[PDB]
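A common beginner's mistake is to predict each chain separately and then try to dock the pieces by hand. The better habit, illustrated here, is to supply every component at once so that their relative placement is modeled jointly.
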Amino acid sequence: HQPLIARDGPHPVEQPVHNYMTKVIDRRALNAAFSLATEAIALLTGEAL
Amino acid sequence: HQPLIARDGPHPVEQPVHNYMTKVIDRRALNAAFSLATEAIALLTGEAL
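With all components supplied together, the output reads:
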């Protein structure tokens, strides 16, 4: 909401303005890589025990 | 009212002085606009209620 300052003619009379605005969300991500190795699966599976 | 300082000859002899001005008022105005809208009139009026 914007204000006024009343002036005198012939400055045409001004009326209180208003502003209605909206915004749209924007989207991103992040990434990290955990990779294992073959035998380490056998040890955790228990197969190579 | 303006004052005197009494001098000597051969300087001429000055007299008391008095000054009267009267200023005229200067006039102006200001302006602001309230404007409404139609469907807003019907509400407050009680009509569309």
